[PDB]
Write a protein that binds this DNA or RNA. Structure first.
Ligand SMILES: Cc1cc2nc3c(=O)[nH]c(=O)nc-3n(C[C@H](O)[C@H](O)[C@H](O)COP(=O)(O)OP(=O)(O)OC[C@H]3O[C@@H](n4cnc5c(N)ncnc54)[C@H](O)[C@@H]3O)c2cc1C
Length: 456
DNA sequence: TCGGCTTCGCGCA
DNA sequence: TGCGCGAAGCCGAT
């Protein structure tokens, strides 16, 4: 569909049809940004070829009721900033409320749209909406991967067992799919309040707020400023100050040596391709660049691969055969501790290290990457069943992580509990052959006491 | 039919 | 802290 700096492998057709004489509609769901967005860039190119304007539509669903105010405010503030950014480029943005399968189909007919484009997400609920829209529209429907550097359907045609099998496939396609982004051209032709939906949503989620003993909210909203501009500042400071020591200190939660980009990456407020572009050009420690590029390229995009080819990604069925046989054999082992969902959520376990990891999650909304493995693994050790641990870990991860409800969350929890993208280890009680992590193992790798005291 | 597995624990400089 | 080894099942290059 036209374009010079435009790889057609990034786009794929979801429904054929006659191209109408109306504007091109970019159904924005996962990549909530204006810059470095192929889906918006593909939409603009199609609109330019048909001499029609491009418009952006965003449907706010009832899914926010399953999470907290921390995610709702982070997303909505960025949407307000994005609204002004698209206005400066003469691109109007429409915000609907309701079921996307019903609202997008009504919007496509009332607005007389000619072409429908959306960004890619391997989540189950995104696929259900697409099927409902396909059955309710008669215009062409395209789908652009704006979240991965190499399109998810292109990087592999099957579920990848581990990273060392997916790594050569991804890095071979980098010289083709790693490139600069063209500027978003403004519109030539021109043709609900987000402040009201913020107040309405906040009031709804107020009774479910995480509070301390004295009714004070646990969440500290100053650690991450939401928005496209604020995302770029974080990436700049990571390259300048932290990328040099990332390789040595990534597994030390006492040092803030991570990139902190996951909240922005999840909501799409910054493109992972942009970060990789800048990281590649940066002159820093060769070991740290390789370690960082491995996380944001290999392990990020294999989480999309995991969820795209396994629709039961959030279930015990998705675990490999050896892990399922190992976890089943130990179902009758006596657990040294059994905690309920309520006890885990309030950080009332016997392990001060686990409790502190939970307190980082409750208060900041971003648990450290190393402690997240220890966090989910201990849930498996102190729960009734592998199913209950998966359910509890997914519940606490989506409710409280800013980067939650993400394919990284499900694949990461799958790695911790079911050994997805991992291998077998020493046979143990309860967890079987799943990789084990101990408090004493953390003590020799980082100052565990300093971490505990920072979060009570 | 081997070789090596993100993110392991453990003994030893 | 940094390093080598143990302990485990399997993909994939042949
Ligand atoms: C049990 C568990 C739950 C997690 N929950 C989430 C989640 O809800 N949402 C989320 O985005 N990530 C989650 N992570 C993945 C990973 O821990 C986060 O990407 C990271 O901790 C966020 O901090 P950062 O962006 O500064 O990390 P960095 O070290 O700076 O990583 C750079 C980027 O690489 C990607 N990445 C890094 N580590 C991983 C990983 N292990 N798996 C997949 N991608 C990775 C992310 O996009 C991340 O932003 C989870 C991991 C585990 C083990």
């Amino acid at each position: 569909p036209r374009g010079s700096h435009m790889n057609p492998k990034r786009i794929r057709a979801l429904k054929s049809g006659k191209q109408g004489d109306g504007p091109v509609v970019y159904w924005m769901s996962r990549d909530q940004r204006a810059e470095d967005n192929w889906a918006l860039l593909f939409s603009r190119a199609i609109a330019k070829e048909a001499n029609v304007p491009v418009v952006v539509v965003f449907c706010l669903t009832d899914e926010f009721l399953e999470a907290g105010i921390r995610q709702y405010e982070f997303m909505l503030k960025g949407l307000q900033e994005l609204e002004v950014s698209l206005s400066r480029k003469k691109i109007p943005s429409f915000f609907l409320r309701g079921d996307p399968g019903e609202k997008i189909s009504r919007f496509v007919k009332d607005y007389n749209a000619g072409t429908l484009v959306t960004d890619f997400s391997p989540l189950r609920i995104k696929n259900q909406w697409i099927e409902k829209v396909i059955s309710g529209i008669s215009i062409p429907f395209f789908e652009v991967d704006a979240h991965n550097v190499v399109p998810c359907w292109e990087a592999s045609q099957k579920h990848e067992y581990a990273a060392h099998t997916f790594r050569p496939k991804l890095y071979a396609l980098l010289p083709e799919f790693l490139e600069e982004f063209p500027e978003l051209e403004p519109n030539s032709v021109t043709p609900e309040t987000l402040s009201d939906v913020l107040e309405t949503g906040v009031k709804a989620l107020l009774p479910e707020r995480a509070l301390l003993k004295n009714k004070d909210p646990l969440f500290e909203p100053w650690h991450f400023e939401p928005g496209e501009k604020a995302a770029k500042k974080v990436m700049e400071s990571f390259i300048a100050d932290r990328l040099d020591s990332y390789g040595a200190l990534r597994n030390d939660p006492t040092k803030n040596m991570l990139s902190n980009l996951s909240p922005y990456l999840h909501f799409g407020q910054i493109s992972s391709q942009r970060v990789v572009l800048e990281v590649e050009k940066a002159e820093s420690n060769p070991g740290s660049k390789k370690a960082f590029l491995d996380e944001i390229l290999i392990w990020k995009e294999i989480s999309d691969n995991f969820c795209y080819y396994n629709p039961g990604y959030d279930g015990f069925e998705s675990f490999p055969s050896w892990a399922k046989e190992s976890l089943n054999a130990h179902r009758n082992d006596v657990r040294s501790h059994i905690y309920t969902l309520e006890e885990f959520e309030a950080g009332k376990t016997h392990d001060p290290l686990w409790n502190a990891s939970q307190m980082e999650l409750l208060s900041t909304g971003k648990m450290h990457g190393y402690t997240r493995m220890y966090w989910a693994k201990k849930i498996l050790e102190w729960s009734e069943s592998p199913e209950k641990a998966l359910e509890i870990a997914i519940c606490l991860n989506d409710r409280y992580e800013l980067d939650g409800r993400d394919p990284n969350g499900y694949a990461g929890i799958a790695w911790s509990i079911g050994g997805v993208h991992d291998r077998a280890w020493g046979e143990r009680e309860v967890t079987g052959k799943i990789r084990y992590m101990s408090y004493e193992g953390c003590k020799r790798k980082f100052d565990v006491k300093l971490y505990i005291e920072k979060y009570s």
